[PDB]
Symmetry: C3
Subunit: 139 residues, 3 copies
C-alpha cells in the first residue's frame, strides 16, 4: 500500500464553490499526496493516471447561452506555468444535467501541482454523492 494516491470529493457543505476534500469513507490522500490551496501536490517524479468528474445541474434554460467547462491543469514546480492537460466544454441549453469526465496518463515531477477547475460553481451538483471527484495514482 505504498503508491502515491488520491481520490478527493467536492465538499457537500461548501456553497457555490468547488472545494476538494479527503474523506474517511471511500476517499484517499495517501503515500505523500497532499491537498494544498485546493490542488493535489505530487510527492515524487513518475507516471500518473489523473482523472476528474463534475456534474452540472440547472433548473431551466436562461436568456444567455451557457457554456460549462471542466479542466485539469498542471502547475510545474520548476516554472510556475499552468498548462491544460485535459478539458471539455458542454452547452446544456440550445431541470438539466451535464456530467463531464476527464482522464489521462502524464509524466509529472515532484512538487508539481494539479488543479481540477470549473467556470460555473453556481451550477455544480456537489450535494449528491459520487458525482464530483478528482484523483491520481502513481503507475
Amino acid at each position: 500500500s505504498d503508491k502515491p494516491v488520491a481520490h478527493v470529493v467536492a465538499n457537500p457543505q461548501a456553497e457555490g464553490q468547488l472545494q476538494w476534500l479527503n474523506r474517511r469513507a471511500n476517499a484517499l490522500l495517501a503515500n505523500g499526496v497532499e491537498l494544498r490551496d485546493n490542488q493535489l501536490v505530487v510527492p515524487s517524479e513518475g507516471l500518473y493516471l489523473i482523472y476528474s468528474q463534475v456534474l452540472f445541474k440547472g433548473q431551466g434554460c436562461p436568456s444567455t447561452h451557457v457554456l460549462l467547462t471542466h479542466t485539469i491543469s498542471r502547475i510545474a514546480v520548476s516554472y510556475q506555468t499552468k498548462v491544460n492537460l485535459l478539458s471539455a466544454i458542454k452547452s446544456p441549453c440550445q431541470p438539466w444535467y451535464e456530467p463531464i469526465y476527464l482522464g489521462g496518463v502524464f509524466q509529472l515531477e515532484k512538487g508539481d501541482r494539479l488543479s481540477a477547475e470549473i467556470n460555473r460553481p453556481d451550477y455544480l451538483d456537489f450535494a449528491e454523492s459520487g458525482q464530483v471527484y478528482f484523483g491520481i495514482i502513481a503507475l
Copy 2:
C-alpha cells in the same frame, strides 16, 4: 499476468436488463475476480481502478421528463452496507443517445462486491458492441 482484473460486457441477448458477462473475446474475469449475482467480487485487499460505461438510446421524447442514471456501488463484506462510489445523471429530453462513463480509484477489502446499476434498462443500448462495460484492475 497475476493482477486481479475484470472487464465485463452487457449480455447482448438479455432483454430489458443489464446483465454483465465475461466473454472469450476482449473481456476479462481473471486472477480471483468473480461475477456473482451480477456483481464483481474483490479477491484481495488493495487499490483498484474501477470503471463502467452505459449508453442509453430512445426513439423520441415522452410526455414525462426522463432522468437516466448510472452508478457504481460498494457492498462491504464487513457491514453489508451499499455505498455510492461513482454516479451521474442525464436528462435526454428538454432518436437520442446518452452515454455515461464513470471511473475512479478506491481502497477495497477482500470479499467486497461492486455493482454497476442503471434505472432505465428499457433504454439500455446493449445490442451494439463496445457501448456497455464494467471493469476493475488491482493497482
Copy 3:
C-alpha cells in the same frame, strides 16, 4: 520509467482530420509504443489501460439528424481483424459541444494495433488544447 506508455493528442494544425501526434510537452510515446499509420502499436503482450476523448463542436443544427461516434478498435497481428473495444454515439441536435470519453482494460498481444476513430472530422474541435487525446499504459 520502463512501462510501455502513450498519450497522444490531435494535431491542432491538421485540417478536417483526426491526426494523432506525440508532443514534447505533456504527451508520451515511450518504452516501445509506436505511432504507425495513425495507430498505436503494442510492443509487448499484457494488460493495458486504453483511453481516448474527442470533442465535437458545431455552429448550429443542420437539416439532417447528425450522429457522432468515437471508437477504439483492436487490430490483432495474428489475424488482421479489426474489433470494436470501446465506443459511444451522440446526437447533438434534436454552437453545440459533444465530448466523448472511452476507457477500459484489455489483454493485448505484441504487434497488435489500436485505432481511435470518429465519423465527422469536420466537427472535431482539435484546435483547443486538452480536448482530443488517445492513450495506453501497460499495467
